[PDB]
Design a binder for these strands. Structure first.
Ligand SMILES: [Mg+2]
Ligand SMILES: [Mg+2]
Lengths: 101, 313, 314
RNA sequence: AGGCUUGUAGCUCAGGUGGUUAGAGCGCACCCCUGAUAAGGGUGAGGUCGGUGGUUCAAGUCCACUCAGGCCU
């Protein structure tokens, strides 16, 4: 079996997956997304309201772009980063599926 | 001579109101907030407990468990209070104190699950509550129970057929559980025999899973503000062979159409109601639907959602 | 084949539900929360506008003014939005943000008075607005307009009589304006000719105005919590000839009976609904009412009273 | 003169057998996020792949000649 070596595209995808999980897959962001879906959002420090729902849509679209960058690769570290991105997407979707009904 | 024995038996017979200033005067709105807990869910929270009584599984001594964070909890709460049963609703910690006061003052036992896990944390807590003693608890499973579409096959379908006098040509309803659309579509198209009905599903543009299911694409949801619809999957109550069209609605035009419906029609409406009416509007922008009688479902009232972002200032 | 033309025509036909775990099984609830703005006032806010259309005083080009913020204001808001007229509601500025959001969402114009005077300031400001340009504004005057008992004579009375099949014996109604009690007592005693009906009136014990008026005393009202009833005076719309009894209900009995009604019958109720069911229970302590059909009006739900003292179990 | 070796986004650069047209880091415009900065994500503008031909079903990649720059000369 011929294992490959990564491009700069796949290494960029892996670094994006890791930073997105570290900075945007927190518990506070899932709390904020569920607060945005049922109306009442979390306010500013000076007047107004935060927007966690647009941030979570950005997070999902990023993790899907970097997951479908990494399907048919044969490097094991690329497969582990694909597994981490798939697990974060499943965490978000399992937090959101069936909510509000 | 009609004295209802309890408040669970008072469901249905909602008005079908012509919308005069939204559209061309041929959008007809079935106001489903004229129910004893003021939602479309009062039909299914009555019929699931009636079906559980008829199939012999709900006895004196059997409690009811359901994971819900919407109007099904309020429906199951009033029917469990009216028919003398007990209820434990599992739900995340994120939801408000007003919904908890309404559900606790109506008789339920709230189990608040961890908010980062969210909805499957509520579902798993309901499942271990049931599996601790399976002959004592009962799980209703609103996304798979056929009482959920047969109440719409046996109540609201005949109401639309007898209010329109059979002249319904386009039926438009949002899909949260899919029971309303499949019940009405099954009664009009199969039972009574009008195969020319165009059944249109309303969906969020931020989670368009019915369109991805019809096209063949991967089912891939997201977050949205149109609460009531957009489950994130295709539930077993939804039957895609009855769906002839799907329309995606953004959050802002849903909110603006709800505010239009309140300010110009006098109908208290939620975001899903405005989404369904906006789907009727951007279907009437096509020329072939100019002189079609369009029946649209308005599930809830906006007073239920009064502290939310539907009311700006 | 009934397609309604607007949401104001969908009033009435509210169900009559038997109470099983409160009383002996002969208390019959008329749940008026299943109206298009979820109150008893939906009938009168539609009928006063219909009557002003039929009298010719509500021309195209005429704005409506009414000094209220309660259920009547929401009723006038949805009827003026459904039929296409302008409403100006005058209310004191101590009113909640959420009720003002509900009234602005229905397209009403909210003119706010000061919190020192309150309702008298709201009435005086409404009179000054109508006295500014009288050919454009119009007071509806819920406390003295005969459309208010006219709608309960033409709708509510026939509903109670056709649902009980002529077996009503006692009719409990809380008196805020005295319209539903006058209308139903005028349909059953007058038209159908049943003088045996016992029409009782619910008022607070902190403001026992109807008892002081029937006993020939001086009217001295008081502050109370049962909102919807207890206006502080005898309106021009309550006729005292049709009131047989007056039952005073305290605030705690109303809160506890409304909570009891919600958690034992599944009927979402407010403080006046609990006051009326508490009066029915206080009347079933006597031995002569143990086998009489009791019809009781439940005028509002617990959605509106969600930030009040009714929901204090956390 | 000969033998070699470079040229790809605004700059520095990878590109595995000829296969998404074309990618990364920094730089630019807009949105969320950090009170703010750093850290971090999304969308986009931006590419005669030095030039001319040939081969192939298909050329940034393989050849032939030129333009400009680096080594022994
Ligand atoms: Mg965060
Ligand atoms: Mg360069």
């Amino acid at each position: 079996k011929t294992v490959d070596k990564l491009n700069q595209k796949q290494e960029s995808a892996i670094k994006k997956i890791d930073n997105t999980i570290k900075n945007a897959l927190k518990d506070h962001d899932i709390i904020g997304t569920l607060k945005d879906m049922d109306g009442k959002p979390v306010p500013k420090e000076n007047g107004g309201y935060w927007d966690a729902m647009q941030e979570m849509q950005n997070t999902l679209r990023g993790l899907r772009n970097h997951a479908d960058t990494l399907k048919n690769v044969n490097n094991p570290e690329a497969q582990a980063a694909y597994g981490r991105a798939t697990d974060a997407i499943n965490k978000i979707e399992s937090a959101l599926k069936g909510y509000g009904i | 001579s009609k004295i209802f024995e309890d408040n669970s038996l008072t469901i249905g017979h909602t008005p079908l109101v012509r919308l005069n200033r939204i559209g061309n005067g041929r959008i007809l709105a079935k106001v489903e907030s004229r129910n004893p807990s003021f939602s479309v869910k009062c039909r299914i929270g009555a019929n699931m407990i009636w079906d559980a009584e008829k199939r012999g599984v709900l006895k004196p001594g059997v409690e009811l468990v359901e994971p819900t964070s919407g109007n099904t909890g309020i429906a199951l709460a009033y029917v469990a209070a009216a028919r003398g049963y007990k209820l434990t609703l599992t739900m995340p910690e994120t939801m408000s104190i007003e919904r908890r006061k309404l559900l606790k003052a109506l008789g339920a036992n709230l189990v608040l699950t961890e908010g980062a896990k969210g909805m499957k944390g509520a579902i798993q807590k309901a499942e271990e509550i049931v599996a601790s003693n399976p002959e004592k608890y009962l799980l209703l499973q609103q996304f798979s129970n056929p009482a959920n579409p047969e109440i719409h096959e046996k109540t609201t379908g005949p109401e639309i057929w007898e209010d329109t006098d059979g002249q319904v040509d386009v039926f438009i309803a949002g899909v949260g559980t899919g029971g309303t659309l499949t019940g009405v579509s099954r009664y009009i198209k199969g039972t009574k025999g009008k195969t020319d009905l165009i059944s249109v599903a309303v969906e969020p543009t931020d989670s368009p899973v019915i369109a991805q299911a019809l096209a063949g694409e991967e089912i891939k949801p997201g977050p949205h503000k149109i609460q009531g619809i957009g489950a994130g999957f295709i539930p077993a109550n939804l039957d895609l062979k009855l769906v002839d069209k799907v329309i995606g609605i953004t959050n802002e035009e849903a909110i603006s159409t709800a505010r239009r419906l309140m300010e110009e029609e006098g109908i208290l409406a939620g975001i899903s109601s405005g989404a369904a009416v906006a789907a009727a509007l951007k279907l009437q922008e096509d020329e072939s639907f100019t002189n079609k009688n369009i029946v649209v479902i308005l599930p809830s009232s906006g007073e239920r959602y009064l502290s939310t972002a539907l009311f700006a200032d």
